[PDB]
């Protein structure tokens, strides 16, 4: 009913390509600039001379207010810095970490993040190489090929294709005589600024089935950890609303994405991704 209502609302404005969606997105962008100017969303830490080299993109810095502060191996002169933010879940908890594609020299920091926050599942929405270009460092282990950074040793335990566009990697990670299972899901064919839809949903369901109970955040990244990252988080958020049955009467995608954007820069990056989101939500409902 809340669902059918949302659906009714979407159809009534011309669906996916309705003019009003552009206006909504334009408005989200406006609120974003406004936040920067008001300093509600700042990038002091990302801008520090010690941290600048840890950003893959010079124009994508984590917001100070929600940034992930690393304290593992702090005791030994490690920096607290990683280009990543927390995003709140439906229940107000820190349900997601949105972060960039690790660089060769941030690989260790990525794993510090995964260990410190007890992450069980990572969703990667990019590829190591896209068109040109290196877009994310391999931070997982390969079959006959541990990966070692600092005190961490990553081992590939198995890997299978969940489906045509999604790889599932089962990893063991070892740090200080301790092992933990970590599952990584990688979507192979999602272009940056763009959109995949069935398999993305299978990715989210799978992630949610591996995660189980437990308060630990999901780790969601792309190349910069904005566009494709935000889409993923938003989809999981809304699916979580849905599963609960807590879709309000006045349910607004504009307000969900707005809240995302508040917590990770460019969480949903393009109008085209914004439309796709509306559409995915429709489907999830129908």
């Amino acid at each position: 009913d809340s669902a059918r209502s949302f659906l009714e609302r979407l159809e009534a404005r011309g669906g996916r390509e309705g003019a009003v969606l552009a206006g909504e997105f334009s408005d989200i962008q406006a609120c974003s600039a406004a936040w920067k100017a008001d300093g509600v969303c700042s990038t002091v830490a990302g801008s520090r001379p010690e941290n600048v080299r840890k950003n893959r993109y010079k124009d994508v810095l984590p917001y100070d207010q929600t940034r992930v502060i690393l304290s593992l191996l702090q005791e030994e002169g490690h920096s607290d810095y990683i280009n990543g933010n927390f995003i709140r879940g439906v229940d107000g908890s820190l349900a997601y970490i949105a972060t960039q594609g690790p660089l060769p020299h941030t690989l260790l920091d990525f794993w510090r993040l995964v260990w410190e926050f007890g992450v069980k599942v990572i969703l990667m929405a990019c590829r190591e190489i896209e068109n040109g270009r290196k877009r994310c460092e391999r931070y997982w282990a390969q079959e006959q090929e541990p990966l070692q950074t600092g005190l961490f040793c990553i081992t590939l335990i198995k890997e299978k294709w969940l489906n045509e566009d999604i790889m599932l990697r089962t990893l063991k990670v070892t740090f200080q005589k301790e092992s933990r299972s970590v599952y990584q899901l990688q979507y192979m064919s999602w272009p940056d600024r763009g959109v995949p839809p069935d398999h993305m949903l299978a990715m989210v369901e799978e992630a949610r089935r591996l995660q189980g109970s437990g308060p630990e955040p999901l780790c969601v990244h792309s190349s910069a950890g904005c566009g494709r990252t935000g889409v993923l988080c938003t989809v999981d958020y809304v699916r979580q609303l849905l599963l609960t049955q807590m879709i309000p009467p006045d349910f607004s995608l504009f307000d969900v994405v707005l809240k995302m954007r508040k917590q990770r820069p460019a969480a949903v990056q393009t109008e085209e991704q914004y439309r796709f989101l509306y559409h995915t939500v429709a489907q999830m409902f129908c």
Binding site: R56, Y57, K58, D59, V60, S223, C226, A266
Partner: peptide, 5 residues
């Protein structure tokens, strides 16, 4: 490189 442009 910049990611947004």
């Amino acid at each position: 490189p910049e990611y947004l442009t």
